[PDB]
Ligand binder design. Structure first.
Ligand SMILES: CCCCCCCCCCCNC(=O)N1CCC(C)CC1
Ligand SMILES: CCCCCCCCCCCNC(=O)N1CCC(C)CC1
Lengths: 193, 193
């Protein structure tokens, strides 16, 4: 039951490594999960709903990892503090590139995917802004741009730049350089005048 | 002839203000240009080809403006130098929001739109990197990240952030704040250690 759903989700994540959702049939998902087509429809209404659930799992995996980091005392080294946090996103989305690629594409065609992504980006921006505000309050960061506006641009940079790196787009930062690239821009923009 | 093509392009840019390309018919474009459907097909093969030409015009308008700025002596004020350049993109794409929105959407579905955008982003990144290299050579900027990698991330930030602002996405930087936001991040990341 839970196990049926897990098998459909695992099959979909596997097939998305090889081809887009458009070239994956319900027969393919049902076959991979060892069930019939009609039994598939008991668990999910469409292959698009399967992708929504996969992306929801990956997004909440990143969010929960960030929460675990937030619960711990702050790294006393400002650059390392931000690197560890950006690395949650680098590793979580980078470890699920098939879902990341299919989920990005689906933001265009699916209101539910677009709203899921928007909701979590707002959460992540709000958290970023609250950390920059704490750094300013402690006298560690200068009072330059409105923190929420700076947070927004930095989060959008990461959204576009990490994706271009994962997907091997031209142009892109090489995957093996993207974390250092983003950390530099975050730290100089948060701490600089 | 040239004038036929201009009227079809003007009609398409006007209708894209109100609805997406999917809800614009060839009859709509032909009607707006004062021609028949078959006469439309003499000038363009599809409504998608019309959008390609519109986006090509806007992209080359931005590129030519950047070239005009590049031809002049450099602004001696580093922050203003980068602000004027980012403003070319802010004003050119911001003055054509209907084409910008339709062109962004088309990167997903059109190889020709995706390649056009990729080509000009590579050009703009290469130019950015060459300016950062000149600033380092003159001793005005520190030798931190590889210039081309830093340029790539900053250009991708602008691509995503300017678009989110123009489209009124949630999240986004308000349009009236986006130029200052991006200039701050560029200048601190290019000149900071
Ligand atoms: C579906 C779609 C695909 C795409 C995906 C990937 C992207 C991701 C992004 C993220 C942002 N954010 C960040 O990055 N951060 C914040 C907080 C912290 C503190 C750090 C960082
Ligand atoms: C179709 C799609 C839509 C989207 C559009 C808009 C975006 C734009 C972007 C640009 C990048 N770049 C920049 O920004 N820059 C460089 C150089 C100079 C020097 C500055 C700046």
């Amino acid at each position: 039951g839970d196990d049926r759903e897990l098998a459909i989700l695992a099959t979909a994540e596997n097939l998305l490594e090889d081809r887009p959702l458009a070239d994956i049939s319900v027969d393919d998902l049902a076959k991979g999960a060892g069930i019939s087509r009609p039994t598939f429809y008991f668990y999910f209404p469409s292959k698009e709903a399967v992708l929504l659930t996969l992306l929801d799992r990956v997004v909440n995996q990143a969010d929960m990892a960030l929460q675990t980091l937030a619960e711990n005392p702050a790294d006393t080294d400002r650059e390392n503090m931000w690197r560890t946090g950006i690395n949650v996103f680098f590793e979580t989305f980078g470890s699920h590139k098939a879902v990341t690629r299919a989920g990005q594409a689906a933001r265009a065609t699916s209101v539910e995917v677009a709203e899921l992504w928007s909701t979590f980006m707002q959460k992540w921006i709000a958290y970023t802004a609250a950390v920059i505000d704490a750094e300013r309050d402690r006298g560690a960061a200068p009072r330059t741009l409105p923190a929420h506006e700076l947070a927004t641009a930095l989060n959008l940079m990461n959204e576009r730049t990490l994706f271009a790196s994962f997907a091997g787009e031209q142009p892109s930062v090489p995957e093996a350089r993207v974390l250092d690239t983003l950390v530099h821009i975050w730290v100089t923009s948060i701490y600089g005048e």
